[PDB]
Write a protein that binds this ligand. Sequence first.
Ligand SMILES: Cc1cc2nc3c(=O)[nH]c(=O)nc-3n(C[C@H](O)[C@H](O)[C@H](O)COP(=O)(O)O)c2cc1C
Ligand SMILES: O=C(O)c1[nH]c(=O)[nH]c(=O)c1CCc1ccc(-c2ccccc2)cc1
Ligand SMILES: CCCCCCCCCC[N+](C)(C)[O-]
Ligand SMILES: CCCCCCCCCC[N+](C)(C)[O-]
Ligand SMILES: CCCCCCCCCC[N+](C)(C)[O-]
Ligand SMILES: CCCCCCCCCC[N+](C)(C)[O-]
Ligand SMILES: CCCCCCCCCC[N+](C)(C)[O-]
Ligand SMILES: CCCCCCCCCC[N+](C)(C)[O-]
Ligand SMILES: O=C(O)c1cc(=O)[nH]c(=O)[nH]1
Ligand SMILES: [Cl-]
Length: 367
Amino acid sequence: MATGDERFYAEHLMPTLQGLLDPESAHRLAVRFTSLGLLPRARFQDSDMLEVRVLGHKFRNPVGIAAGFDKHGEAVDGLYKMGFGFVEIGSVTPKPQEGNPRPRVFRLPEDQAVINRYGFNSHGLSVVEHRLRARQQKQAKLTEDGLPLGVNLGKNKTSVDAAEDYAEGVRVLGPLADYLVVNVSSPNTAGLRSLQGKAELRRLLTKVLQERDGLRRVHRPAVLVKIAPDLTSQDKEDIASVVKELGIDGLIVTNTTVSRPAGLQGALRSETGGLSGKPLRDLSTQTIREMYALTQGRVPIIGVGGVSSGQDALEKIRAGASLVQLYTALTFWGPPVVGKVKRELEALLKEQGFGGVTDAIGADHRR
Ligand SMILES: Cc1cc2nc3c(=O)[nH]c(=O)nc-3n(C[C@H](O)[C@H](O)[C@H](O)COP(=O)(O)O)c2cc1C
Ligand SMILES: O=C(O)c1[nH]c(=O)[nH]c(=O)c1CCc1ccc(-c2ccccc2)cc1
Ligand SMILES: CCCCCCCCCC[N+](C)(C)[O-]
Ligand SMILES: CCCCCCCCCC[N+](C)(C)[O-]
Ligand SMILES: CCCCCCCCCC[N+](C)(C)[O-]
Ligand SMILES: CCCCCCCCCC[N+](C)(C)[O-]
Ligand SMILES: CCCCCCCCCC[N+](C)(C)[O-]
Ligand SMILES: CCCCCCCCCC[N+](C)(C)[O-]
Ligand SMILES: O=C(O)c1cc(=O)[nH]c(=O)[nH]1
Ligand SMILES: [Cl-]
């Protein structure tokens, strides 16, 4: 196949919207529309070849919405409707906070990229908890039906105890989540990425895991750590070592990059913030590949960064990802991108002689 809506969105609707509205306004409107289920028809029907079992769950397809689109858990059901196999909300911080001053998001159209410096704009734990609670049973059913929910946790700008911020998040939202993410890789909170270093991480993660283990069984989420694409080889080794020592459930690979790859064309390339989309794609993929190897393929990875096609998804899966996420591609191609990626991925799995996604995970390593 290959669709009318895909072409219409790509060639007319999205460019027109970007023309009318700055990126943060467009994002806010998109959250609203999605929250109301005002979406183009998602014709694609997930086949069994797309199902994955990981992280204590069944995932009907392996394509999720990355953190940052639904920061505050306002559009979860709309996102499933859009065809994502799983939804991750957040980052959520303990107390509400405004984030950085505007403008703080920038398009690089020539690069199929975005740069953001939101700074964990967040409604806070309390608000989000209540919002999730209002739909908790409906989510339990969705999760049973292979449509899990992740919650990504951040820390407030003025916090004097990062580990406590994460612990508070585990206590408040963990009971509502299939998986939690310790996001220690935003580039837009001072000092945060230092939490990726070995001693800090071990201390923070031990606390987080303790908190988690203290939740009742039916409310006990998987815990993953989301890492930057900008780590040294030493940092990566250290993270793998800690994940193994502590039994962390998985990794999310990667956040945005503070690098500016050679060749960027957008006028806005030198704006401060994290860069996402196509220029991030292979950097991301390579990081997955390295982490999979460092963890002996025993630690589930959710691969993210510059996925806008089936090939992109498959490349990450073959590199070691059990699941993938996308955000920036949505910002270019709109909702039809979801079915596009899934249709393309199913075709390529068939063409490469995989019985389904599961058979492709980590395949490059076994060559
Ligand atoms: C506007 C924007 C906001 C984001 N905010 C968050 C966040 O709150 N937490 C997080 O873990 N990642 C956040 N990210 C990163 C994405 O989850 C993802 O890791 C990254 O953008 C790479 O995927 P992509 O190239 O498909 O966008 C954000 C990304 C963008 C573009
Ligand atoms: O337009 C953007 O630049 C932008 N930037 C971001 O950083 N985040 C965003 O979310 C966006 C907007 C992307 C978007 C997503 C969904 C839609 C949509 C939703 C429902 C129905 C039709 C379109 C439209 C635009
Ligand atoms: C101005 C010359 C015509 C170019 C417009 C592009 C053709 C249609 C694009 C795809 N469609 C919107 C029909 O789905
Ligand atoms: C609310 C819709 C207002 C639309 C006004 C702009 C129409 C320009 C069409 C541009 N394009 C050829 C890319 O579709
Ligand atoms: C109101 C300012 C002009 C924007 C009108 C909306 C259509 C913009 C489409 C731009 N472009 C031709 C590059 O697609
Ligand atoms: C709402 C402020 C700017 C308008 C941008 C585009 C809105 C398009 C509305 C489409 N719809 C068919 C649902 O009415
Ligand atoms: C009814 C047409 C409304 C005029 C819209 C003016 C364009 C807004 C500027 C957005 N921008 C090009 C900076 O993205
Ligand atoms: C955030 C920009 C949204 C603009 C276009 C919305 C199109 C909605 C189509 C709804 N329908 C249910 C009619 O498909
Ligand atoms: O809120 C942000 O600035 C944000 C958080 C995150 O983890 N990644 C990112 O690119 N932006
Ligand atoms: Cl420059």
